[PDB]
Structure formats: structure tokens, C-alpha cells
Amino acid sequence: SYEKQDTLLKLLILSMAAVLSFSTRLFAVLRFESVIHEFDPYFNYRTTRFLAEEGFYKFHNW
Amino acid sequence: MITDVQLAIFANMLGVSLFLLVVLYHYVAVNNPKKQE
Amino acid sequence: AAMLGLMYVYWTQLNMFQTLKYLAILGSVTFLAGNRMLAQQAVKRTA
Amino acid sequence: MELEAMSRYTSPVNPAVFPHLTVVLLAIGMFFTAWFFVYEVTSTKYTRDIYKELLISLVASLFMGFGVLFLLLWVGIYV
Amino acid sequence: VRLDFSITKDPAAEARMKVACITEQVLTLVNKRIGLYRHFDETVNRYKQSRDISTLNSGKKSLETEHKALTSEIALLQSRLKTEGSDLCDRVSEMQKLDAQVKELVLKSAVEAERLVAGKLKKDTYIENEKLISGKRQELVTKIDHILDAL
Known part of the structure; x- marks a missing residue:
């Protein structure tokens, strides 16, 4: 029924778009390593692993 | 491991398939009677 | 009423995570009772 | 019950096999998943049946x- | 999907939904009317193979019973659609007006097959009468499919 085909084609298009969005950003991991780039991301990484270890209230007061 | 060339090909093919499918969707839309009643 | 009273206990004693851990439950029950009561009122109004 | 007299074991799913199964099973699951969601989004209070x-x-x-x-074995994150 | 967060119904959307359910039911019953005509045409082929009239007579009576039941259920559901004010009720009436002529053409086809097997109709005339009957049948079916799209 026409509604099924319209729904199918919407779902298929959007799931391909999602898979493409995720997959096109992997080039850097495939070429070298699953490691953090640039200078600024390292502060976000250190602070993130802090919050992941010490808990919110000790990160906020940190 | 998969190389960045095999990924580049895969992504090119996904892109082409996506845009061709959207250009099909516009036909499946305009042919609809209920969209224009 | 309990949902509005919880705000005094949060101001005096609780932290945020505890406050939300209570307010989730109390808002869920208040929402279910409000939806049922409002549907009844809507029928009575529209009758 | 001492070493040289006994037997040995390995997974009957052999190294080369996983790349096939992963593809086949995921293709099937994607088929039935698409069917599920198309059926759920199309059907309606009068037209759904639980058992399907x-x-x-x-x-x-x-x-x-x-x-x-x-798939995870093919990747080699052996459980 | 089973739960509903709703307060005020909109009976107009409920009518738009029940009408759609009933229209899908009617569409299925109509597809079974076409399938009963395919059963009957198969029964006519079996008749030509067998030259046994009892097969096709039982086919005719099973048609004029089950297709008649489908027509009655169609008209009762159409009475529901009429109560719902649906502009589709009178167009299911139009489809039944076409299908009554398709029915009389099927009866003519069965009569011409009975005459052919009885030798009352000659092959070179049977061929032309078949081509005309099935041609106007296919025309009526195309009209039917357009009116069903009009539902």
C-alpha cells in the first residue's frame, strides 16, 4: 500500500544518510590510530577522564 | 584492516546511491494522488 | 502539593541528584492523575 | 589423567567462516527490522495484530x- | 505504540481511520471477487477439459453465493461509510455497478464455453466473442482499479 512504500523509502534513505555520516569521518582512525588530535582536544580529554573518575561534585569544585 | 582507499570507494558509492534514491523519492512523491487531493 | 513542598526540602537539605530522583517519581504519578482528571473534566465540559 | 594421553579442542566455527555468517545474519535482521518498522508505522489501532x-x-x-x-568475533573482540 | 497520551478525542480523525480500515477490508473483499472470477475462469477451463457441466454449475452457484455474500457485506460497510458521510460510498456503488456488468460478461463467457463444448458455438466465432468479452472485462477492470484508486 502506498503508505508502506513511502515509509520504507524514507527509512531507507535516512538510514543510508546516517551510515554515511558516521562512516565518512573514520579516515583519520584508519590511517593512523584511535588517538586524540590537535592541541586543544587534550584538555577536554584530561577533564573528561577526571569527571569519569572523581564524580561530578569533585569536578565542579575542581 | 580496511584501507582508506576502500573506505573512499565505499563512501563514494553510498553518496551516489543516496542521491539517486532521493531523485527517485521525488518521483514517488509527485506521482502520489493523495499528495494533490 | 508534595511536588511544591519538595522544593523546600531541596533548598534546605537535598542535593540535585536526590531531588530529581524523587521528582521523577512524584511528577510521573502527578502527571498520570492529572491526565485522567483532566480528561474527565474535558468530557464534563464538552457534554 | 595426564597430558600426552588426552585430546584437544577448537571451535567448530573455523577462522574463515565468520565473515560469511556475519553478513548473512545482519542482512536478514535488517530485512525483518525494516519490515517491522514499516508495519508499525503504517498500521493503526484497527489494523495491527500483536502476534505478527x-x-x-x-x-x-x-x-x-x-x-x-x-561481527564482534570477526573484528576479533573475542567475547 | 500501544499507550496513548491523549485527552480530547477528535471523532473526525476516528472517522478518517475507521473509513480507511473498512476501505482496506472492502478492497480485500473486491480482490477476492476478482479471485472468485479467477476461480470461475479456472472452473471454465476445467469444464472445457472435462465437458462436465456439474463442475461449472457448482462453480456458478458458489460464485452467486460467496460473491453475493461479499457484495452484501460491501453494501453494509458502504452503509457505514455513508453514515460517516464518505464520498467513497457512492463510488463503491459505481464499482459494484461495473462489477455487475463484469459478472454478466462472465456469465456470457460461461455460456459461450458451454455452447462451444456443446458445439452450439464454433471455434472461430468463440475466439472473437471471447476476445470481445475479455476485452471489455479488462476495460471494466481498469475502470474498477481507477475507482479503487479514487477511494
Whole structure:
């Protein structure tokens, strides 16, 4: 029924778009390593692993 | 491991398939009677 | 009423995570009772 | 019960096999998943039946669940 | 999907939904009317193979019973659609007006097959009468499919 085909084609298009969005950003991991780039991301990484270890209230007061 | 060339090909093919499918969707839309009643 | 009273206990004693851990439950029950009561009122109004 | 007299074991699913199974099972699970969601979004309070939804969802679960397993073994995150 | 967060119904959307359910039911019953005509045409082929009139007579009576039941259920559901004010009721009436002529053409086809097997109709005339009957049948079916799209 026409509604099924319209729904199918919407779902298929959007799931391909999602898979493409995720997959096109992997080039850097495939070429070298699953490691953090640039200078600024390292502060976000250190602070993130802090919050992941010490808990919110000790990160906020940190 | 998969190389960045095999990924580049895969992504090119996904892109082409996506845009061709959207250009099909516009036909499946305009042919609809209920969209224009 | 309990949902509005919880705000005094949060101001005096609780932290945020505890406050939300209570307010989730109390808002869920208040929402279910409000939806049922409002549907009844809507029928009575529209009758 | 001492070393040289005994036997040895390995997984009957051999090294070369996982790349096939993962693809097949995930393809099937994607089929039934698409069917499930198209059926759910199209059908309506008067037109749904529980037993069809349950069967489609159970089958899609079986196939997806084993496909992801063989996928993670293919990657080599051996459980 | 089973739960509903709703307060005020909109009976107009409920009518738009029940009408759609009933229209899918009617569409299925109509597809079974076409399938009963395919059963009957198969029964006519079996008749030509067998030259046994009882097969096709039982086919005719099973048609004029089950297709008649489908027509009655169609008209009762159409009475529901009429109560719902649906502009589709009178167009299911139009489809039944076309299908009554398709029915009389099927009866003519069965009569011409009975005459052919009885030798009352000659092959070179049977061929032309078949081509005309099935041609106007296919025309009526195309009209039917357009009116069903009009639902």
C-alpha cells in the first residue's frame, strides 16, 4: 500500500544518510590510530577522564 | 584492516546511491494522488 | 502539593541528584492523575 | 589423567567462516527490522495484530543478536 | 505504540481511520471477487477439459453465493461509510455497478464455453466473442482499479 512504500523509502534513505555520516569521518582512525588530535582536544580529554573518575561534585569544585 | 582507499570507494558509492534514491523519492512523491487531493 | 513542598526540602537539605530522583517519581504519578482528571473534566465540559 | 594421553579442542566455527555468517545474519535482521518498522508505522489501532509484530520482532532479534556476535568475533573482540 | 497520551478525542480523525480500515477490508473483499472470477475462469477451463457441466454449475452457484455474500457485506460497510458521510460510498456503488456488468460478461463467457463444448458455438466465432468479452472485462477492470484508486 502506498503508505508502506513511502515509509520504507524514507527509512531507507535516512538510514543510508546516517551510515554515511558516521562512516565518512573514520579516515583519520584508519590511517593512523584511535588517538586524540590537535592541541586543544587534550584538555577536554584530561577533564573528561577526571569527571569519569572523581564524580561530578569533585569536578565542579575542581 | 580496511584501507582508506576502500573506505573512499565505499563512501563514494553510498553518496551516489543516496542521491539517486532521493531523485527517485521525488518521483514517488509527485506521482502520489493523495499528495494533490 | 508534595511536588511544591519538595522544593523546600531541596533548598534546605537535598542535593540535585536526590531531588530529581524523587521528582521523577512524584511528577510521573502527578502527571498520570492529572491526565485522567483532566480528561474527565474535558468530557464534563464538552457534554 | 595426564597430558600426552588426552585430546584437544577448537571451535567448530573455523577462522574463515565468520565473515560469511556475519553478513548473512545482519542482512536478514535488517530485512525483518525494516519490515517491522514499516508495519508499525503504517498500521493503526484497527489494523495491527500483536502476534505478527511479536513474530517479526522475535525473528529480527534472533538474527541480529547472532549476527552482531559473529561481527564482534570477526573484528576479533573475542567475547 | 500501544499507550496513548491523549485527552480530547477528535471523532473526525476516528472517522478518517475507521473509513480507511473498512476501505482496506472492502478492497480485500473486491480482490477476492476478482479471485472468485479467477476461480470461475479456472472452473471454465476445467469444464472445457472435462465437458462436465456439474463442475461449472457448482462453480456458478458458489460464485452467486460467496460473491453475493461479499457484495452484501460491501453494501453494509458502504452503509457505514455513508453514515460517516464518505464520498467513497457512492463510488463503491459505481464499482459494484461495473462489477455487475463484469459478472454478466462472465456469465456470457460461461455460456459461450458451454455452447462451444456443446458445439452450439464454433471455434472461430468463440475466439472473437471471447476476445470481445475479455476485452471489455479488462476495460471494466481498469475502470474498477481507477475507482479503487479514487477511494
